[PDB]
Amino acid sequence: HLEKSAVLQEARVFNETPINPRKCAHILTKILYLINQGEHLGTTEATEAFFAMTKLFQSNDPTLRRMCYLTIKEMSCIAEDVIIVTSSLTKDMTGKEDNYRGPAVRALCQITDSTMLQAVERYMKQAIVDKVPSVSSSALVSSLHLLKCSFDVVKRWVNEAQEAASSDNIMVQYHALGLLYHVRKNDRLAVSKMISKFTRHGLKSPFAYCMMIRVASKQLEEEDGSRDSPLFDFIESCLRNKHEMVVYEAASAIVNLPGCSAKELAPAVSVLQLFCSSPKAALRYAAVRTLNKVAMKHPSAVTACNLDLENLVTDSNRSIATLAITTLLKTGSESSIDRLMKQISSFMSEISDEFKVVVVQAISALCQKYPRKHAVLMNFLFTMLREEGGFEYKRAIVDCIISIIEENSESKETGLSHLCEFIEDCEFTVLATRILHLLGQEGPKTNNPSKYIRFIYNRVVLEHEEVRAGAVSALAKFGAQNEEMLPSILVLLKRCVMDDDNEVRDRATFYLNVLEQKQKALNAGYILNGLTVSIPGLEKALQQYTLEPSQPEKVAATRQEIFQEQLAAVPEFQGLGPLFKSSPEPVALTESETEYVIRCTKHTFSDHLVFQFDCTNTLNDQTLENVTVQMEPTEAYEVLSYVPARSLPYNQPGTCYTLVALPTEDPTAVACTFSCVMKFTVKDCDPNTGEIDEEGYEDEYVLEDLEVTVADHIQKVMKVNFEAAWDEVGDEFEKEETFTLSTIKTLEEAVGNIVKFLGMHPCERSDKVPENKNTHTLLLAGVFRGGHDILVRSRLLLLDTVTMQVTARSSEELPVDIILASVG
Amino acid sequence: MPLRLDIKRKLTARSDRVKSVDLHPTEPWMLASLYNGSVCVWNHETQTLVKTFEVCDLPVRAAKFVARKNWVVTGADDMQIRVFNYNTLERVHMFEAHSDYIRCIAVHPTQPFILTSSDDMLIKLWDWDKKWSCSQVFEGHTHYVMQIVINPKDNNQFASASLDRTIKVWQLGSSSPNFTLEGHEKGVNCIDYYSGGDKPYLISGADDRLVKIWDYQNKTCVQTLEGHAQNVSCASFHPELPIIITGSEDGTVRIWHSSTYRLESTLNYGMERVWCVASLRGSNNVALGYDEGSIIVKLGREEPAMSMDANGKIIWAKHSEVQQANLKAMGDTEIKDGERLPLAVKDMGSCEIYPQTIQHNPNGRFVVVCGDGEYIIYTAMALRNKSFGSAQEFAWAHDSSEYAIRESNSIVKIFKNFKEKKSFKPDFGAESIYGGFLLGVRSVNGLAFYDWENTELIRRIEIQPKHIFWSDSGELVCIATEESFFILKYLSEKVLAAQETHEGVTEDGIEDAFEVLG
Amino acid sequence: LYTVKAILILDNDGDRLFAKYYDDTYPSVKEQKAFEKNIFNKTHRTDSEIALLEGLTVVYKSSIDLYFYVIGSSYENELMLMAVLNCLFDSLSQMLRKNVEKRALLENMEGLFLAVDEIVDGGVILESDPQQVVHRVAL
């Protein structure tokens, strides 16, 4: 239509004296036209045009004002000294009428940056509360843009934003709730308060419902303090308003992840909610679906089926038919697959071009995804090969072949062989590469390789370089794997085809010379089956889904080992007792992502305990350095050393340790409590993940106590015969004490309490005791730190409560004393 | 919309129609100008009437204090402003302020000026130092100049409201109004500024039942306030609190939240026809002139809600680097004890309710925001919704994983892990709650302590408290009382026999289970 | 906050008489036109309120020599999108003072540009009331 240069240029007159609202407005229209028609502005002339226009803001005409808003936003980024236009926009923005109000806030806020943010706020507060949708919605979207430049200004507007939220007017609410969710967010909980306020309400605003559904879709039970249900009384889990999109979004989330469970007037576990909307017009597309559903997509699938299946078969309209395939695909599942496959077979008949490729891929893809047997997948993959013969590709040769060598290989090659009979050189580089690669790699004894070779030999002549090169190298590997083959390799390679073309020659000269001339140490080594060049995943199935309706390694296996590894890096802990075990009951001192996350584990050594404290400073305003967790033992333990966490910045874990020595004569338990306080140096930080200030202050954060149990000292085992082990460990360290467990009225619980506490597995599966028997003998075994066995015998008497005489024997005085004390 | 208020009747006085009410610029006295021909001033803190002045024998519409001279200016239907010394009790000066009675006077403490507004459609300027010579005369208003106020961002500027449907902003220098605002549609009774160094606002009140808010910077009308259900006599802005206080000739005063204009309160008194309003510039006293007298009233919010944990998250609401609606604040600073320490705030996540009281947990694991009969619990430094609960009041106890709440059913409640405890439910009634381990509940002129064990009455102390706080051993309690303070001993064993036995009376207790230590 | 991906009003080839991009995904002419050609090819010569293109529900209508578009998300349905598309058709008609054809649009290029910006704002649905848009815009 227009020329960008002439129009950008003539705009410069505004900058001088002429303001002429008609002429300038036209010139502006022309700018909008240059963009719209599709053109790109030249920067010098743009920069000039922008400074010129600001003069035009003096004249207040509604059409000129309008031109001015669109033109400055489009020209804003390809212009300089734009800042002048802010004042003019504020002047316009306060002027009453929707033409100015709404369009200005949007143009102003786009140009506005954090410095300028402050200016627009009075006018913004006035514009947001409006139940006149233009002014309010433009102001609400405007605030969203402004969250970037400066967050804090926008946040103050949360009250005006909320005020708009209370409208049932669709725009004012959609914008209000949507924006609010973004704005007020400083934690989940404050947003959740905003949502609960609207939540109990039966809106007539579908957009608000939708934007909110998304916020809601996850279970929120902290909305406005707390509440006893994930409840959403606005359609998400409810079905207060029917309207097929909202109904679909809501129904797929709620069914197997309740936003609330099913109500008689609002299904929300049952499959129903989608289905009542399901017979419909074009509208049906949302309605008919599924996704998730109780307990599977399949009972759901049956409802809707009439609709999806008739459109999919009948309509050879692309627009309908696509909705019908997506809808079939959605009502699908593992079960559904029988049905889904016949339909997809049928579908290509309506739209057959790419759609053909897709159905032959889909039937294979569905068989791989939803199991109807891996074999059937191969058989479908043959049908794909047959029908298209060329829309298979290179990625198919690699994917078919890799997939095939899971089971199919002998068959696949053979099928491929037959498939190769097709068409000599229009079959493509890829099929020849597949029969060639497979015949090379398997080295057929399932069928005679001679047919395969004869088929491939012809294809090579008239097809691309990459296959002819493929054919020589394959032949060489084929030689190395099977001796028999060598005579065919020679007739093929001497030919002008499989060698002596171009690329084919170079590869061949190498491959040939290595087979012919050389040892074939290399050739032998090279064939490991004669496999592909790469093993990807199973690419086809996802591709197909969209297209149709258009080494974790480990050391440790035990808590002691993983901790032992962590400990081992540090010297002191392995140098001063080596680790018998680490706790089977590690206790987290301070909860996750509050102030600190500290998890401590107590590790036992031959004569020591090391406490590993994994410390996180989740303090947004700080970053920590030289952090240690300090300890006060409540019994006689010596605290030898502290190992610091070098730094703990915001949200970054670090580990600190305290090594203490264990008593080895203590008459009371090694079940003991340590009071923990982390001390550290704080340097100020701007929350990101870390950043330290030039100077800072000392600060401390209090932590929970760490409890060490007898369970940490002992590792559980059972014995085949307790009595022998029990005598064998040391009846010379034997001590006996009688306890009453009055809070345990039966033997079975009693055995469980001694077993858990001590960290001893009761022998011979003695946690199950004959219910309410007068006498019982409980056999305990486990190994104590240092590597010495500890056996405990508890002879239980059951009155109405449990009394036990617990006799313990151990290769030391300490386990005996420790167990006896801890139990009572 | 919720707001910290507590309307209290500081002093009342009965007299013939008081057109103007004032607070003394720097003194705790409020002056009311009456239609008794007398103006009277009373210091409504000690409830002493400091002095009266007989300006005229015909109504004195206006009176204000020019605090520096130690003088009071009055304008009466003598069409004079007469000046008196309020400690040497004599008439300092007499002058004719206008050709008609003087509705309002405004005093510029920084300049020698009073400008007075009169219903001769003119506002005139007088300079006290010249012995009340006419410094300047302002001609602009074409109708009865009901009220004058000085802008606090430029004292050289004032606005005058006239029943001519405008409020005209004038400058001293210029007789004429340097710009006009058309603030109302049925004449403007009052003009006020919303006070501060960064607040360019006007308010207009009119007899169309409505008070309107205007922004003088933008020149637009920010919102319209319903005002009253009858002609709005006057309207004014409270400075500190976000509200507008208006009065009407229906004898009703209404308070409107200045963030959504939803009715905060309606107040009547049996005095009726409320002519004026004015607000204290240092905030939380408003005074309102009625037909049958004057009242000085004291508004609520005197103190902030905040709590300091052990994580260095000291949380408040409102303030700087914190919003009121959301929750934030941190204070990790330890700079010298002799001065006030910086804000030192670090950002804190989500909230969903308003903070009637907002508090961190005393050892740092919870945050509580309480508001509107509900408590919401947010996590110490992560601020994800932990928990919820009911609370017209929330108090952390000593335990602080057991807390006391008033759920307002007439039993003081304990919630433990933010879940209600019904093993706690006083055999007193309730009127109010004190936290700590033995929950004090006040009822029937008693303070009763209840067990968190079986909710039996342990003891009753016959002087009601301000507070109960219990030590972190729960044997010793500190009682804030009008008595002054008690420390009491709870003997645990004595309580266990007594409580089981329930020898402690329903409303009088057992005087042994607790003992008065000091 | 997002519903509408883009709005296009296209001649009966898919070429840009108009498009205004409420996505940031097409700003350059080459690609804005490619998009336009892409959506017009699927959707056209089968009029319904549904089309699925690019995994997005595309809602479209037609006139004498134009096809009118809203592209939006497919987690929705036609009807939500349709409300935008109906506004788009309607508002242009009432605004221009003549029904949407290539002729009405070209007749008043300014009315068309302004009217569409009121309907969609950066992919959020700003307005959907045809009447409101038309008063809001000044020719």
PDB file of N, CA and C in Angstrom, chain A residues 483-524:
ATOM      1  N   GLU A 483      31.998 -65.544   7.855  1.00  0.00           N
ATOM      2  CA  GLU A 483      33.052 -65.937   6.918  1.00  0.00           C
ATOM      3  C   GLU A 483      32.596 -66.246   5.493  1.00  0.00           C
ATOM      4  N   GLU A 484      31.429 -66.856   5.437  1.00  0.00           N
ATOM      5  CA  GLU A 484      30.596 -67.319   4.350  1.00  0.00           C
ATOM      6  C   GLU A 484      30.376 -66.189   3.397  1.00  0.00           C
ATOM      7  N   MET A 485      30.144 -65.041   4.010  1.00  0.00           N
ATOM      8  CA  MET A 485      29.727 -63.881   3.282  1.00  0.00           C
ATOM      9  C   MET A 485      30.778 -63.294   2.319  1.00  0.00           C
ATOM     10  N   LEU A 486      32.090 -63.467   2.655  1.00  0.00           N
ATOM     11  CA  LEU A 486      33.170 -62.857   1.933  1.00  0.00           C
ATOM     12  C   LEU A 486      33.130 -62.918   0.374  1.00  0.00           C
ATOM     13  N   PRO A 487      32.754 -64.003  -0.250  1.00  0.00           N
ATOM     14  CA  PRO A 487      32.601 -64.091  -1.679  1.00  0.00           C
ATOM     15  C   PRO A 487      31.599 -63.092  -2.335  1.00  0.00           C
ATOM     16  N   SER A 488      30.464 -62.781  -1.667  1.00  0.00           N
ATOM     17  CA  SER A 488      29.507 -61.851  -2.162  1.00  0.00           C
ATOM     18  C   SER A 488      30.110 -60.437  -2.059  1.00  0.00           C
ATOM     19  N   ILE A 489      30.881 -60.217  -1.012  1.00  0.00           N
ATOM     20  CA  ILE A 489      31.468 -58.869  -0.678  1.00  0.00           C
ATOM     21  C   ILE A 489      32.325 -58.609  -1.849  1.00  0.00           C
ATOM     22  N   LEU A 490      33.146 -59.590  -2.210  1.00  0.00           N
ATOM     23  CA  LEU A 490      34.062 -59.318  -3.349  1.00  0.00           C
ATOM     24  C   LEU A 490      33.270 -59.014  -4.658  1.00  0.00           C
ATOM     25  N   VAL A 491      32.219 -59.712  -5.092  1.00  0.00           N
ATOM     26  CA  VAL A 491      31.564 -59.376  -6.385  1.00  0.00           C
ATOM     27  C   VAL A 491      30.980 -57.964  -6.368  1.00  0.00           C
ATOM     28  N   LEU A 492      30.375 -57.547  -5.244  1.00  0.00           N
ATOM     29  CA  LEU A 492      29.739 -56.275  -4.988  1.00  0.00           C
ATOM     30  C   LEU A 492      30.796 -55.096  -4.962  1.00  0.00           C
ATOM     31  N   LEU A 493      31.819 -55.219  -4.163  1.00  0.00           N
ATOM     32  CA  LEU A 493      32.750 -54.178  -4.068  1.00  0.00           C
ATOM     33  C   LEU A 493      33.593 -53.874  -5.267  1.00  0.00           C
ATOM     34  N   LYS A 494      33.876 -54.835  -6.167  1.00  0.00           N
ATOM     35  CA  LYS A 494      34.689 -54.521  -7.289  1.00  0.00           C
ATOM     36  C   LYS A 494      33.942 -53.606  -8.243  1.00  0.00           C
ATOM     37  N   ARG A 495      32.576 -53.791  -8.321  1.00  0.00           N
ATOM     38  CA  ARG A 495      31.638 -52.953  -9.085  1.00  0.00           C
ATOM     39  C   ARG A 495      31.726 -51.513  -8.856  1.00  0.00           C
ATOM     40  N   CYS A 496      31.433 -50.731  -9.888  1.00  0.00           N
ATOM     41  CA  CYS A 496      31.541 -49.299 -10.000  1.00  0.00           C
ATOM     42  C   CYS A 496      30.640 -48.538  -9.167  1.00  0.00           C
ATOM     43  N   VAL A 497      29.786 -49.276  -8.462  1.00  0.00           N
ATOM     44  CA  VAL A 497      28.642 -48.894  -7.675  1.00  0.00           C
ATOM     45  C   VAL A 497      28.953 -48.823  -6.236  1.00  0.00           C
ATOM     46  N   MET A 498      29.221 -49.985  -5.594  1.00  0.00           N
ATOM     47  CA  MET A 498      29.424 -50.128  -4.174  1.00  0.00           C
ATOM     48  C   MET A 498      30.759 -49.683  -3.752  1.00  0.00           C
ATOM     49  N   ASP A 499      31.648 -49.460  -4.771  1.00  0.00           N
ATOM     50  CA  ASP A 499      32.880 -48.782  -4.637  1.00  0.00           C
ATOM     51  C   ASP A 499      33.015 -47.909  -5.867  1.00  0.00           C
ATOM     52  N   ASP A 500      33.928 -46.964  -5.841  1.00  0.00           N
ATOM     53  CA  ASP A 500      34.338 -46.195  -7.042  1.00  0.00           C
ATOM     54  C   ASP A 500      33.217 -45.427  -7.572  1.00  0.00           C
ATOM     55  N   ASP A 501      32.607 -44.611  -6.782  1.00  0.00           N
ATOM     56  CA  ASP A 501      31.645 -43.633  -7.225  1.00  0.00           C
ATOM     57  C   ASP A 501      32.247 -42.277  -6.770  1.00  0.00           C
ATOM     58  N   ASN A 502      32.234 -41.973  -5.438  1.00  0.00           N
ATOM     59  CA  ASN A 502      32.707 -40.732  -4.899  1.00  0.00           C
ATOM     60  C   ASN A 502      32.884 -41.004  -3.461  1.00  0.00           C
ATOM     61  N   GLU A 503      31.886 -40.654  -2.583  1.00  0.00           N
ATOM     62  CA  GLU A 503      31.938 -40.940  -1.182  1.00  0.00           C
ATOM     63  C   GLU A 503      32.080 -42.407  -0.935  1.00  0.00           C
ATOM     64  N   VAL A 504      31.379 -43.163  -1.824  1.00  0.00           N
ATOM     65  CA  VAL A 504      31.250 -44.570  -1.756  1.00  0.00           C
ATOM     66  C   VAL A 504      32.637 -45.210  -1.866  1.00  0.00           C
ATOM     67  N   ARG A 505      33.544 -44.634  -2.740  1.00  0.00           N
ATOM     68  CA  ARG A 505      34.855 -45.031  -3.016  1.00  0.00           C
ATOM     69  C   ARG A 505      35.632 -44.843  -1.784  1.00  0.00           C
ATOM     70  N   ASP A 506      35.658 -43.703  -1.133  1.00  0.00           N
ATOM     71  CA  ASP A 506      36.546 -43.378  -0.030  1.00  0.00           C
ATOM     72  C   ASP A 506      36.338 -44.322   1.120  1.00  0.00           C
ATOM     73  N   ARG A 507      35.047 -44.477   1.495  1.00  0.00           N
ATOM     74  CA  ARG A 507      34.645 -45.386   2.556  1.00  0.00           C
ATOM     75  C   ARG A 507      35.008 -46.749   2.181  1.00  0.00           C
ATOM     76  N   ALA A 508      34.747 -47.125   0.922  1.00  0.00           N
ATOM     77  CA  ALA A 508      35.032 -48.410   0.422  1.00  0.00           C
ATOM     78  C   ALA A 508      36.471 -48.778   0.432  1.00  0.00           C
ATOM     79  N   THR A 509      37.373 -47.833   0.053  1.00  0.00           N
ATOM     80  CA  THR A 509      38.786 -48.028   0.005  1.00  0.00           C
ATOM     81  C   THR A 509      39.280 -48.370   1.425  1.00  0.00           C
ATOM     82  N   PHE A 510      38.809 -47.618   2.401  1.00  0.00           N
ATOM     83  CA  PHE A 510      39.026 -47.984   3.704  1.00  0.00           C
ATOM     84  C   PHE A 510      38.479 -49.281   4.200  1.00  0.00           C
ATOM     85  N   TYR A 511      37.192 -49.530   4.009  1.00  0.00           N
ATOM     86  CA  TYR A 511      36.506 -50.653   4.528  1.00  0.00           C
ATOM     87  C   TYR A 511      36.987 -51.923   3.905  1.00  0.00           C
ATOM     88  N   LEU A 512      37.212 -51.875   2.588  1.00  0.00           N
ATOM     89  CA  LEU A 512      37.676 -52.950   1.713  1.00  0.00           C
ATOM     90  C   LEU A 512      39.045 -53.319   2.128  1.00  0.00           C
ATOM     91  N   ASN A 513      39.970 -52.314   2.322  1.00  0.00           N
ATOM     92  CA  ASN A 513      41.348 -52.530   2.502  1.00  0.00           C
ATOM     93  C   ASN A 513      41.515 -53.167   3.821  1.00  0.00           C
ATOM     94  N   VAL A 514      40.665 -52.768   4.788  1.00  0.00           N
ATOM     95  CA  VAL A 514      40.694 -53.378   6.107  1.00  0.00           C
ATOM     96  C   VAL A 514      40.205 -54.823   6.099  1.00  0.00           C
ATOM     97  N   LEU A 515      39.187 -55.134   5.319  1.00  0.00           N
ATOM     98  CA  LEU A 515      38.805 -56.476   5.201  1.00  0.00           C
ATOM     99  C   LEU A 515      39.698 -57.357   4.425  1.00  0.00           C
ATOM    100  N   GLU A 516      40.126 -56.915   3.205  1.00  0.00           N
ATOM    101  CA  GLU A 516      40.909 -57.555   2.182  1.00  0.00           C
ATOM    102  C   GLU A 516      42.230 -57.651   2.645  1.00  0.00           C
ATOM    103  N   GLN A 517      42.901 -56.524   2.878  1.00  0.00           N
ATOM    104  CA  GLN A 517      44.267 -56.481   3.186  1.00  0.00           C
ATOM    105  C   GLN A 517      44.599 -56.794   4.562  1.00  0.00           C
ATOM    106  N   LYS A 518      43.899 -56.276   5.500  1.00  0.00           N
ATOM    107  CA  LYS A 518      44.486 -56.112   6.808  1.00  0.00           C
ATOM    108  C   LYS A 518      44.046 -57.328   7.655  1.00  0.00           C
ATOM    109  N   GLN A 519      44.443 -57.357   8.945  1.00  0.00           N
ATOM    110  CA  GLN A 519      44.265 -58.411   9.885  1.00  0.00           C
ATOM    111  C   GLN A 519      42.787 -58.724  10.133  1.00  0.00           C
ATOM    112  N   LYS A 520      41.935 -57.671  10.178  1.00  0.00           N
ATOM    113  CA  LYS A 520      40.549 -57.774  10.563  1.00  0.00           C
ATOM    114  C   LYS A 520      40.377 -57.918  11.976  1.00  0.00           C
ATOM    115  N   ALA A 521      41.400 -57.436  12.721  1.00  0.00           N
ATOM    116  CA  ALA A 521      41.347 -57.232  14.174  1.00  0.00           C
ATOM    117  C   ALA A 521      40.417 -56.115  14.317  1.00  0.00           C
ATOM    118  N   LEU A 522      40.601 -55.153  13.371  1.00  0.00           N
ATOM    119  CA  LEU A 522      39.865 -53.999  13.343  1.00  0.00           C
ATOM    120  C   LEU A 522      38.410 -54.229  13.007  1.00  0.00           C
ATOM    121  N   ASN A 523      38.098 -55.035  11.938  1.00  0.00           N
ATOM    122  CA  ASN A 523      36.835 -55.477  11.343  1.00  0.00           C
ATOM    123  C   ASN A 523      36.045 -56.271  12.352  1.00  0.00           C
ATOM    124  N   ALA A 524      36.724 -57.223  13.027  1.00  0.00           N
ATOM    125  CA  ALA A 524      36.146 -57.993  14.052  1.00  0.00           C
ATOM    126  C   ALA A 524      35.641 -57.175  15.211  1.00  0.00           C
TER     127      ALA A 524
END
